[PDB]
Write a protein that binds this ligand. Structure first.
Ligand SMILES: Nc1ncnc2c1ncn2[C@@H]1O[C@H](COP(=O)(O)OP(=O)(O)O)[C@@H](O)[C@H]1O
Ligand SMILES: O=S(=O)(O)C[C@H](O)CN1CCN(CCO)CC1
Ligand SMILES: OC[C@H]1O[C@H](O)[C@H](O)[C@@H](O)[C@@H]1O
Length: 477
């Protein structure tokens, strides 16, 4: 069984969110579970420089211009790179220019990603051809459409990591992407009078997967599907929609082995976590104090994540005696609101605006609680990292957060299953009840520790996820 993943990012070479983490760990896990998994990425500069043994496989002309298909290895996995300097050799984000504007040739940049995933099924590589083409998110959304246009020489799965990003392009671009004009239909890739790369992946894929069991159900609702629900409801009924939870990459996210930490520690030696906390307090400019709970955020700053609610609730949090440490970048309203909060409460609120990979480990390894108050959350990896690091997650019951965190209620405590704090509604009062829950658990240090050790007993394994993907791939054949 040979599978090609088609995607736009991969940790540690290029990452803007959780997707990169998945693509960096899932394939190696699949190989260990008996599937021959390879990855296809655009040759963005950080990607191209990371794959140092890449060799030429072929050259082709394309509706988007010429490509050199390269193949090398990263961390023992086979990586194909689409080297097309005129599309992909640009600094910064893979998705937008330095002024945060989507590149105007994005339609071609990402149509080509999908076209190459499909062509791989037709022998683009003389020495290897996938049985299944596994496309991830809108960027890779056209891979199943090109496959359909060609008579489906391989099967396809489409995984939605996030249904809010739809890859909308004007309809006239049907002229530019070499697909049958007849694909521009409601039963096809048309969505609200435009081309949608997400609609295309959802429509043409043999099977659709979401990145948690509950998100898979949620996207059959208008509230989470934003117009795709009728399509997703139909695929559910046909048995062509399922949820497979993400794992965590233990080589990177384990406090037991984490070289990025002041002090490593385990489920049975959590006293060794305290130094991380002390150093994090110093680093953020917070008061150095082990008697006080340290709440943290590590997160993209968009409305998805419900962080305006954190701002609203912050005075309540401070009033009860907690600190906040935030790392994140995105919406300038959020950036400026949190900077202002940091300026307003020196020693209580510490804030760093930007993307900082190493610093996120130091937060995760030093904080007491991780706040993930999402409006929607396909999976959420930060809360999985908190569990593993014994930093109790405080989450809204939605998406993968609903699948992974167990509230500190009476039954869950008694059953020894409690691992974090959960609130229901997207408003600051509801968030604030869970925060108070946290302060109450905090005043009972031996209950807090009991909850920490259960959080750290939870396991989210990529080789277990791969078993599920593998069953799917074989069912498809
Ligand atoms: N500002 C940041 N600095 C460093 N890492 C970040 C930052 N923001 C998000 N991350 C990381 O990006 C990944 C986010 O994954 P996830 O929780 O699934 O949410 P999303 O994919 O929606 O961003 C995690 O590894 C998280 O630690
Ligand atoms: O905004 S764009 O649609 O132009 C580009 C991406 O959709 C932005 N992303 C990166 C991939 N994502 C999933 C990463 O976990 C979040 C949305
Ligand atoms: O699948 C990895 C990540 O993808 C998406 O970007 C989601 O926003 C996030 O919840 C998920 O964990």
């Amino acid at each position: 069984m040979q599978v090609l993943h088609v995607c736009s990012e991969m940790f540690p070479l290029l990452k803007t969110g959780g997707l990169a983490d998945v693509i960096g760990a899932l394939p190696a896990a699949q190989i260990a579970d008996g599937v021959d998994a390879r990855v296809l990425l655009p040759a963005f500069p950080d990607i191209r420089r990371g794959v140092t043994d890449a060799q030429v496989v072929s050259r082709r002309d394309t509706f988007a211009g010429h490509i050199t298909l390269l193949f090398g290895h990263y961390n023992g996995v086979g990586i194909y790179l689409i080297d097309a300097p005129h599309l992909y050799d640009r600094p910064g984000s893979p998705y937008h220019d330095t002024n945060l504007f989507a590149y105007t040739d994005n339609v071609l940049r990402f149509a080509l990603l999908g076209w190459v995933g499909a062509e791989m099924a037709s022998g683009l590589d003389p020495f290897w051809r996938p049985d299944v083409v596994h496309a991830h998110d809108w960027h890779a959304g056209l891979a199943p459409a090109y496959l359909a246009a060609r008579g489906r020489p391989a099967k396809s799965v489409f995984t939605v990591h996030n249904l809010a990003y739809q890859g909308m392009f004007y309809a006239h671009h049907m002229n530019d992407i070499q697909l049958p004009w007849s694909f521009f239909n409601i039963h096809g890739l048309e969505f609200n009078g435009q081309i949608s790369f997400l609609k295309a992946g959802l429509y043409y894929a043999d099977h659709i997967t979401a990145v948690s069991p509950t998100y898979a159900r949620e996207i059959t609702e208008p509230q989470f599907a934003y117009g795709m629900e009728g399509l997703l409801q139909q695929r559910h009924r046909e048995g062509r929609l399922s949820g497979v939870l993400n794992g965590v990459d233990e080589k990177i996210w384990s406090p037991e082995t984490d070289l990025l930490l002041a002090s490593r520690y385990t489920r049975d030696t959590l006293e060794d976590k305290a130094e991380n906390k002390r150093q994090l307090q110093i680093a953020m400019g917070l008061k150095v104090d082990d008697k006080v709970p340290l709440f943290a955020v590590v997160s993209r700053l968009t409305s998805q994540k419900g962080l305006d609610l954190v701002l609203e609730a912050l005075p309540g949090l401070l009033e009860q005696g907690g600190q906040l440490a935030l790392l994140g970048a995105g919406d300038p309203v959020l950036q400026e609101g949190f900077l202002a909060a940091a300026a307003e409460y020196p020693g209580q609120v510490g804030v760093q605006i930007g993307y900082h990979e190493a610093f996120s480990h130091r937060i995760m390894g030093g904080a007491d609680v991780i706040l993930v108050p999402s409006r929607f959350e396909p999976c959420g990896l930060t809360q999985l990292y908190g569990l593993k690091y014994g930093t109790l997650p405080l989450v809204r019951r939605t998406g993968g957060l609903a699948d992974t965190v167990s509230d500190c209620s009476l039954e869950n405590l008694a059953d020894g299953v409690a691992s974090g704090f959960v609130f229901e509604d997207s408003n600051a009062w509801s968030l604030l009840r869970a925060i108070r829950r946290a302060f109450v658990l905090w005043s009972r240090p031996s209950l807090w520790r009991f909850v920490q050790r259960q959080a750290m007993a939870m396991d989210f394994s990529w080789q277990v996820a791969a078993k599920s993907y593998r069953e799917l791939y074989y069912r498809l054949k």
